[PDB]
Amino acid sequence: MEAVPRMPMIWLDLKEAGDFHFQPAVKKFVLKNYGENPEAYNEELKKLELLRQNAVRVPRDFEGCSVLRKYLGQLHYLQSRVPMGSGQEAAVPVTWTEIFSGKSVAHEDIKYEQACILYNLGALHSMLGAMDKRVSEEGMKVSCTHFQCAAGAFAYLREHFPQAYSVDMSRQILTLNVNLMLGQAQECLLEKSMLDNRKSFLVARISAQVVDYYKEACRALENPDTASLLGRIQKDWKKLVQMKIYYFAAVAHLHMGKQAEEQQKFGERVAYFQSALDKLNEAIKLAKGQPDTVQDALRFTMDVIGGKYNSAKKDNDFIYHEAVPALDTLQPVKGAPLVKPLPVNPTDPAVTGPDIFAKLV
Amino acid sequence: VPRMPMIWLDLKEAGDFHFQPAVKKFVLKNYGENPEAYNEELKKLELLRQNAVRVPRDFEGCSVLRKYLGQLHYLQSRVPMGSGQEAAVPVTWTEIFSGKSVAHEDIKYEQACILYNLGALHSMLGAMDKRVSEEGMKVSCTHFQCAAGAFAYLREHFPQAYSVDMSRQILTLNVNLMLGQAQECLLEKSMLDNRKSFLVARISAQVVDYYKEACRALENPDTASLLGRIQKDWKKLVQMKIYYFAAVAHLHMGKQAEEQQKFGERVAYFQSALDKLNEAIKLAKGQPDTVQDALRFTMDVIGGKYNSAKKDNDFIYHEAVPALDTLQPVKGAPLVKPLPVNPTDPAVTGPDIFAKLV
Amino acid sequence: ENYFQAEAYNLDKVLDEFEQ
């Protein structure tokens, strides 16, 4: 399974920004509250303006993630000194396009700007994770980290912005994104554990956790409220995720059979390979109409499993003569979560750089 | 610029938290045989706790508590050690005001007390600096905001008071007290930065607002009986600061009037400032000379400015001295907030200890 | 800072811990 073709990965689109005309409000605030000349802070106002321009049309590359983090941090610094939140003195309209309906959604709340930047940070990470071919050890670790970062941005959004500014950032939808990104992160790590030929029981647990994440993501995709919101996107994701559920369940039992082989449980060995083959055949059924990237991985795995089943059944029938136990007689494989949503500290000075607005207050 | 003394909170004393037996029991049934693989992940947390519960009272002391607080979150994510859960063990800490030992079989009790001590340590580091230089005022201000943030997080995420020192009313007292002192540090900075007199007046008025909030809690009978002597010493300093910074506020309102050539209004504000200061001196009885020296010098400033203002008005300007209700009160300008704690920040927690406890 | 690169590099350590 070292050379198994890599499955395609899902990525989210970035939200697109409207207007955020903070400049008049900051100068209104400094004039009225500080009794100072607002033009003394024009330079701090250029930096944030230039920083926003870069962030709202961020380039889709690794460096773009730092641009979004730095702008996210500077928004926190600005909010600490100028009250631009909901119902506050210096608040101005913040407009962003809700990604699923295309509606313009406006809030006089700087936290709305923060939320959408954080959403795009998670989206951008998902893109960078999905772009890599994951041929080399480096690509698998970089993609895995990208997906954990994407899960971390969506998780932070879910926890610290509980009031959903738009339906694309509701708790249910962000939970879908997190579970999907963790499933894809765990998947990359599974590919790593195989290329390193880790202990077979280890791979089986890692693969079983891939199933668990995708099952939770699939439960949200089957929720009618999510289906009507995502529309055709829900159909595209569900097809791939449901197929992956059975594919990686087959991979798990494939390696459970490898473990049985190592412990000389030769009857148990054929049972797991038989189960792995049945689960894969269901994945193949669910994969009909999907691109060749998917088919090549399934075909490749069918050769592996099919060959191992014939070997195990021939060994048991002519040498070991051990009873083939039913599946329920065997303790199930418990998934091992080795990935997590990586926490975000928006005001970490090491990522935000100097506070643009240190001269205020 | 006068520099008043600052209040700080003592750290809670930790008792026993014998998590090793429960973890080993949990991993044996749920993950099978070998306990030996997990003993070092348990010994690393144990040493982390020993450092945290004997944290040195310095800046990195905060990182030690932060690091341990984060690893506790990682442990709770893998081993169910909350109240009513499989692997819960007794957690014992000393309630700081009564000295009584309080035990809960809940890992969130350990987290709460570590978080409390993080806020207490910040208050100490903020109150230790003499605030002579711009960096000292801002550093202390950050510490007091971090202390407010720790007590606020405790108030929001642990609503069920594990002990009376962490009840909603007492944490609210701590937050307002810490924000008042943070605001006070920025007031001092705004004075040495020569900010506009109207802004200094608003900043000082907000100091009064925070301390009034703290003072109403200190006057609550149930808090007085719980805090004991501490309520006396806090209230004595807070009540004095209420009138002192109300005088500082009206001092600078009178200086704004001077800038706008409302020389009658100028007398009214200086007269009001002097009266408020005299009450602060009434309330400052028995307080250390740091307090007395600050008040004595402020009396020189306000007392002289009142005499000059009244002489000028009586012989030159002859403008009507308005009472006091005719002038819109000063609106406070909050410049400080409880800073987020970020308990699971990888930059401070380091790698997750229990990567084997999956 | 190198948080992203540090996390990606640590994945080897993660699997190593989980293997022992």
Author numbering:
A (entry chain B): 1 to 361
B (entry chain A): 4 to 361
C (entry chain F): 2 to 21
Lines quoted from the article behind this entry:
A central feature of HD-PTP function is the ability of its Bro1 domain to recruit CHMP4, the major subunit of the ESCRT-III membrane remodeling protein complex (Doyotte et al., 2008, Ichioka et al., 2007, Parkinson et al., 2015).
As predicted, the 22-mer SARA/endofin peptides form amphipathic α helices in their complexes with HD-PTPBro1. They occupy a larger binding site than the CHMP4 peptides, partially overlapping with the common site across H5, H6, and H7, but extending further into the S site between H3 and H5. The SARA/endofin-HD-PTPBro1 binding interface is largely hydrophobic and involves residues F5, A9/V9, L12, L16, and F19 present in both peptides. SARA/endofin peptides lack the Trp residue conserved in the CHMP4 peptides, but L12 occupies the analogous position, binding to one of the hydrophobic pockets and interacting with L189 in HD-PTPBro1. The smaller size of Leu versus Trp means that fewer rearrangements of this pocket are necessary to accommodate the SARA/endofin versus CHMP4 peptides. Leu16 accommodates itself into the second hydrophobic pocket and interacts with L202/I206 in the endofin-HD-PTPBro1 complex and I206 in the SARA-HD-PTPBro1 complex, consistent with the importance of these residues for SARA/endofin binding to HD-PTP. Phenylalanine residues (F5 and F19), at both ends of the α helices, anchor SARA/endofin peptides into the binding site. Phe19 forms multiple interactions at the common site, including with L202/I206, while F5 fits into the S site forming several van der Waals contacts.
